[PDB]
Scaffold this active site. Structure first.
Site, PDB file in Angstrom:
ATOM      1  N   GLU A 243      28.025  35.235  42.103  1.00 33.19           N
ATOM      2  CA  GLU A 243      29.205  36.298  42.364  1.00 33.19           C
ATOM      3  C   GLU A 243      30.447  35.922  43.123  1.00 33.19           C
ATOM      4  OE1 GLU A 243      29.590  39.140  41.139  1.00 33.19           O
ATOM      5  OE2 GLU A 243      27.795  39.774  40.361  1.00 33.19           O
TER       6      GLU A 243
ATOM      7  N   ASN B 100      40.381  43.383  39.616  1.00 33.86           N
ATOM      8  CA  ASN B 100      40.133  44.039  38.324  1.00 33.86           C
ATOM      9  C   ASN B 100      41.378  44.539  37.935  1.00 33.86           C
ATOM     10  OD1 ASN B 100      37.211  42.765  38.189  1.00 33.86           O
ATOM     11  ND2 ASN B 100      36.986  44.481  39.643  1.00 33.86           N
TER      12      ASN B 100
ATOM     13  N   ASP C 122      40.715  48.027  35.880  1.00 33.20           N
ATOM     14  CA  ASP C 122      40.493  49.462  35.986  1.00 33.20           C
ATOM     15  C   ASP C 122      41.039  49.723  37.703  1.00 33.20           C
ATOM     16  OD1 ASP C 122      38.418  48.055  37.510  1.00 33.20           O
ATOM     17  OD2 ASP C 122      37.407  49.960  37.763  1.00 33.20           O
TER      18      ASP C 122
ATOM     19  N   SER D 283      40.194  48.252  40.335  1.00 40.41           N
ATOM     20  CA  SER D 283      39.157  48.301  41.600  1.00 40.41           C
ATOM     21  C   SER D 283      39.409  46.664  42.113  1.00 40.41           C
ATOM     22  CB  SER D 283      37.958  48.495  40.994  1.00 40.41           C
ATOM     23  OG  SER D 283      37.190  47.625  40.195  1.00 40.41           O
TER      24      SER D 283
ATOM     25  N   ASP E 292      36.597  43.655  43.834  1.00 40.31           N
ATOM     26  CA  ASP E 292      35.237  43.288  44.370  1.00 40.31           C
ATOM     27  C   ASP E 292      35.304  42.716  45.768  1.00 40.31           C
ATOM     28  OD1 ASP E 292      34.338  44.110  41.835  1.00 40.31           O
ATOM     29  OD2 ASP E 292      34.827  42.365  40.937  1.00 40.31           O
TER      30      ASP E 292
ATOM     31  N   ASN F 256      31.781  46.408  44.393  1.00 41.99           N
ATOM     32  CA  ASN F 256      33.121  46.862  44.008  1.00 41.99           C
ATOM     33  C   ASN F 256      33.652  48.447  44.894  1.00 41.99           C
ATOM     34  OD1 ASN F 256      34.413  49.074  41.796  1.00 41.99           O
ATOM     35  ND2 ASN F 256      34.738  46.892  41.335  1.00 41.99           N
TER      36      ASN F 256
END
Length: 130
Positions: free
Chosen positions: A35, A46, A49, A51, A53, A60
């Protein structure tokens, strides 16, 4: 902060991650490695959408932490997403624990399925004394 492998393994064990909700320490190590590369300040937007991380576990903003700019988001960990960018990973760990308390468990992270599930993850903790 960019953690060294064994340094992180020992920290996670002390924070009680080994076997949490049935998840072995080596799995949490495999997850952090893919990750963020063990980097606590890692962020990933992202565009798809809206959002983002955050942190070592790339948690998220849509469900786990509040950043104010993610549409229709909730804050299940009751934390500002900023808390997930600290060098001290205490809050990130408490939030990851909350995240796996859900039915999906560790499968919530698609990177875990691709890179860790059904694989030999011992390499992530070997020689660390945990």
């Amino acid at each position: 902060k960019v953690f060294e492998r064994c340094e992180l393994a020992r920290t996670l064990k002390r924070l009680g991650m080994d076997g949490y909700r049935g998840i072995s320490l080596a799995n949490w190590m495999c997850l952090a490695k893919w990750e963020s590369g063990y980097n606590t300040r890692a962020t990933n937007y992202n565009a798809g959408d809206r959002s983002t991380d955050y942190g070592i576990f790339q948690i998220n903003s849509r469900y786990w932490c509040n950043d104010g700019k993610t549409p229709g988001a909730v804050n299940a960990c009751h934390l500002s997403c900023s808390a997930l960018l600290q060098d001290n990973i205490a809050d990130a760990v408490a939030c990851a624990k909350r995240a796996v308390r859900d039915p999906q468990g560790i499968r919530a992270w698609v990177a875990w399925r691709n890179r860790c599930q059904n694989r030999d993850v011992r390499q992530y903790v070997q020689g660390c004394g945990v």
